[model samples]
Target: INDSNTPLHLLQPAYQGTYGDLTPEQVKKDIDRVFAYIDKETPARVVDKNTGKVITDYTAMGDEAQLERGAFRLASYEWGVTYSALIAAAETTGDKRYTDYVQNRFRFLAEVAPHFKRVYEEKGKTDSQLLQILTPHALDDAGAVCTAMIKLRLKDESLPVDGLIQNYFDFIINKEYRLADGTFARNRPQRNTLWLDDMFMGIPAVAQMSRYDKEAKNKYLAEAVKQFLQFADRMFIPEKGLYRHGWVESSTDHPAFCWARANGWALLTACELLDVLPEDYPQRPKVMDYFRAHVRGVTALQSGEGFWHQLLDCNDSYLETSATAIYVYCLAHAINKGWIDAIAYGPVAQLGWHAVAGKINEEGQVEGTCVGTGMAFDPAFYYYRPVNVYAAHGYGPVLWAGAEMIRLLNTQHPQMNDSAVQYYQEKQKTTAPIFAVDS
Candidate 1:
């Protein structure tokens, strides 16, 4: 789409509303409007007023206790994403209030962590209790808790980093919970396989914790590298710049379908991993190559108006918010990190960001985000499903992408040194032994 008629134009008003040429009071009013919609008691969090069901499944026991768990379930990984967004927003705007809001949520989780531990220990429960408490018959909540712990570590250094980090890694990599093939599983029914989503929820923590522990030869990094390679070998669709949700070896009837959000999860994970991975690590080049390939694929599939569809290859499918936001964040992050040529990727990121910016209403509520999706046997399933825009699942990614793009815009663009690019490219060709362990 051309710049004049595209969603990029709509962002002019939002930019103005946020900080451009407005009186301090007007900007404060705009900020308040945005926060108001996202508040624990806002209409955005309610499903149906008459039915008393929450739209996002978040609950506030009191001012000091609020959980931003989205609908479908309250997995700790999902909550972590939401909390991370709040932290990022706080950082971007220099707002202590946003910081306090995220801290309060973490404090509430700390208060309840012991109760969860007690249930797991005393009841002899094998699966994570938080998942059971929220989804009743699920085994995926541990990933969420792992994500939350990772965010907490970033915000506060004294938050028991070692124990929580070890617990998260052990839960997924140890014999009791590890999949049969040594790859991590999402839950019970899918016990021996890996999901693309798990990479995002789990890999960053593993990488970050490895840094925290100061282990040059960290087992967590080994496991993470192995899992990523296994997932790519099994699930990546090289031609499409996308990945299927999970790999189920036994299911001849069920080839993994490329879910947009699942691909988003992988892309976002790649960007985050690159942020902390050691520069000279053997697996770093492979991961970076995979990221570039995926970004190329995603850029090719960008809709005429700049957002990704719920089913990425299907043009008729409605624009999806979360996946699109995730892709935008990844693209902008790639440019910021010098992983991709900014000239090629900058416009794509700008377009995707504009699409996201336009989705926000005057009241600061975002619209058109697809609701939570599980793996499906048919490709048509995601294409045909309706979406809920204000869900926390979408809100978090939108906030994250916006903050990252804003950061990129503020930083000076890095010069593309051809000699350096060639140096890395040549080095990548000889980086064979780096992944020799996997072979």
Candidate 2:
């Protein structure tokens, strides 16, 4: 068994689209499966055969690495993504279990909040000294975890708000990561290279923090805008309308390969950033221009089935789930927000949603998501890649996209702005103190 204990169904919707296509009974089974997985308290483990006898061991398991790699922090988003989806699904199906599961996951985060914060504040250390050298922050993952925590708080009011949010901003904006010379950098060893994924992982938090601190001359928001421009200048290729996953400033050995997932990260990041970016900000138009360009470029490469390949431009590359889901969510969210002309982007978003929908299996599990990929220079690195359809990495984005689309479809009705309002109110309440920081 895959020891990743991949948070497969978690909070994702058990049913989407028409009930005719996905029966209520089928959806219930999917929801039940997700509940069973978490309720079982299944340890992340693998089975081993020793001396002709089968044994189960947590030691020598792949999950140890997966857990250490980025699992725990990432799981926060996975849970949040599913929670958001379940909220939508619950409303549509009138199933209380979906809401119960979502609330439970939020409570779970609240329970583990202290431990997660301590992991970064005390135990966690990054190999990249540049992060510390630049701003005395731990690393980027902490920022991601913070974003996840904030998203979870949007749903659960009982969750603690003050200490975690304070420490999170301290590490990300005030202390560790920094924007110097117009570009953002991780604090040391790998400082020369800039990865596109950082946009989604870092910038959104920056934007949110900035919005939180709106009255105080807006340093975080300004820096966030500056960082976006800097990243665009360095990594975004106008000719391709796609971002090279990363750029190594010192070496020319790696011909920047256009990775689908990295671009997906950038797209989703931009969408989130745009949602909170104030109307008076100077960078809004520039950001929108880049967003439109990338959307067009990504749309051109979409497969007939509505998904994109691992190596987006390479036809032979295998279709990937995370990137496609992110793209669909970003595009759909843009349309729903009125940031883009719906007529221009609506069709593309629909195609992407359909592609993502197709990935959901008969069991209500999404499949074909490529496991998390690292920065690579070779074009062949992503081409012909193997993928697991049910990887947890894809679940969050898929759930996020599905929920956003469902919200959009019902926009003409009362629920159109309800979730957005709820999300915004929670963000405002949680972030009001962060904004008060500089005052």
Candidate 3:
């Protein structure tokens, strides 16, 4: 939609269109809309046992029965991603309301987890759901929340989250089962199944926790680095740029099901690790190379309308939302950080955000998000997973994508050149205005 009479703005809806003169104002509409939906849907309400009253503040639950169970279970990996997205929202929007959701719930959890742990040991009566943060049975339960907490701590040093953070870190480092080579291995589908999801499930926490170390010298970064290499060596399909969902140590031939969100988890993990890893660290460059290659693989498979299929490379598979939002967030964030070339990945992110924006309904609810999925051997297993707006996983990535695209469009003023998105600042200036009005 780039003719002399009609430019990107004319061809597209406000803020939802991929084609046009992109700016921060275009993204703010989405950020505000999605945040409002989250706040209304998952208001932070903790019940006070003594008063038998419902309140938003972290008053003592004295009894486990008083603990709040709302739409937002703040401890889930899905919410962990939500928390990270809000942090990014605050950074991009400078909106305190965005960050408030995270800080309040995080404080509530910190106050409640210790009491539940103590009560459980003393009275032999505690809610596992209540102490989910303190007692993690798997990497899924521990890692994502730990990474978010690390980011929260970095943002606000006096969070009083030391015990909570230690609990998560220890479980991931010492307790979680691992393969012989120290890979974060799961024994679910088989004896030694390596899941692609574990890359995001565990690695970022290891990488982020390295910053928490008081040691002037490096200690924990290697574990994060090690997890990435180990998972990659086992599951990465170098040719397809996709990772198999599960790898069995006992099998000669692996079932290569390139489930969409799992691959998103893998690439998202690589980007997060690269963001904070020391530039000269031994394994840094190798991770960067792999990240770019996987990016190359994922982007090439993006559909014409910009959504990735449930099984990424399969056209017959339905278009999915959470994974699409994730790729948009990572690609935009990477380009904004100069980790990847804007000229190369900007359109990739644009189509992704445009597709994602269309997925957000009039009520601000996100649609087309797949519910929680498991590793499967058959294609129909993944293909049949239901898509619902209520799925908690979609919120965080949508928040993240909105926040990052705001950064991307703001930092790089992409303009319509030759009827396509061009992402260079110098080029936007010299090229004739695509939209009727210039920002």
Candidate 4:
């Protein structure tokens, strides 16, 4: 090939991308893009749903009045993750806006919940929008939001969230259905079914409750660990080091569908559990073993493009964004916590962050996120699952991954060693193609 006075070797090759350390400022910008969209989309306003007018008076709340519809529901488990991610972003970035967002929504919900509760108790009618807050029917309705409220309460105790928090905790601890062994279980779609998603939905709140309630700290801590172990015993596949999406007690041979987001939920739950567990806690090492094994298993399946496939072990399935972001946050958080070696996992997290950032569009909405998925037995179900921009599941994980990446970058020095992303104990000032020991 002849070049017209152009050094082809020196010129940047087409489709060649570089991956190394990302700046905290850049990560924060990506996070802010999503939050900016969320802030505008989610307004904590009670409104006349049909007329599209804000209801200033609570007494006017009726059949037509409801919590203003947004791209996401504030009381759902997805928003629970979003709320917690906001708190984490605030703590990690020292950004008051993140905290303000959570506070405003939480306060608004707390103020409005009582009115709905009163109406429901008196008139035997409930606003569908406020039902999850006023009366949580499932762990999905209760746990994540409870966890976020507790985190917010830990930061500031004066907020009027006690009544709602107590309701959520009561549901998780006392009322939620469970097996004989106390593992949380559901009956729908199958009898005594265990959803891996419940790991994140239920466990983290129970684990975090220990932090909020001093008197029952040990009890809650024990309950959280026990529940984790029970789920693992039934669902975890030791050979593959992955969890099956759903487990049924009646089936002798289980369908081992290693769904990506379910695995993400399990891993993220482990990380969040470890956050509150004392270093000297008795069963801490067991949780660590499962967590580390899971990190190994999931990280091994990451695509070269940095996103993990919808099915962890299936190559033909579509690459997913939310799961990838969850992995990024967990990996980076593990490195920051010194639970895993940075030299081995830092680049993986870095590459994943890059892939996740690429999914954020100009409007700050996260694209390529699979919508709310339920456990399925066949590959076709997961393979054809639609990914859309409005999936609320993607937002929290993206925020978390971005925030944790910033923290990891601040604590570790990642350098380009022979065009490879490598973590170094000390900062290196070399731009050399190959690092040298001496000048």
Q: Which candidate number has the best TM-score?
A: 4
Against the unseen true structure, what C-alpha lDDT does each candidate score?
Answer: 0.61, 0.59, 0.82, 0.90
lDDT tens readout by residue for model 3, 354-417: 8888888878788999999988888999999999888888889988998999888777767776
lDDT of 4 by residue, 330-395 (tens): 999999999999999999999999899999999999999999899888999999999999999999
How do the predictions measure up, each by TM-score? 0.73, 0.68, 0.90, 0.96
For candidate 2, give the lDDT: 0.59
| 1-439: candidate 1 lDDT, tens digit per residue | 6886675533333232122111223333444455556654321122333444443323322122222233323334555576666676676556777667666545544455444455455555423434333232222445555555666676687665445445555654452344565655655346466677777766666665666566643776776677677778778888787787767766664475667787898898887678777788789999988888888887898986778877777787787878888898788778777788775776677667667666777867667877666766677777776676446577667767776666555553322132111111112223332221121
The runs of at least 3 residues in candidate 1 whose Cα sits more than 4 Å from the true structure, single-residue gaps closed, are: 1-35, 41-76, 115-139, 160-169, 175-177, 186-191, 215-217, 252-256, 412-439
**Which prediction has more favorable lDDT, 1 or 2?**
1
What are the C-alpha RMSDs, in order, of all predicted structures? 11.0, 14.0, 4.1, 2.3
Best by lDDT: 4
TM-score of 3: 0.90
Better of 2 and 4 by TM-score: 4
If ranked by lDDT, best first, what sequence of candidates would result?
Answer: 4, 3, 1, 2
Task: Return the candidate ranking by TM-score, descending.
Answer: 4, 3, 1, 2
Clashing pairs in 3: none
Task: Indicate the worst ten consecutive residues by lDDT in candidate 1.
Answer: 418-427
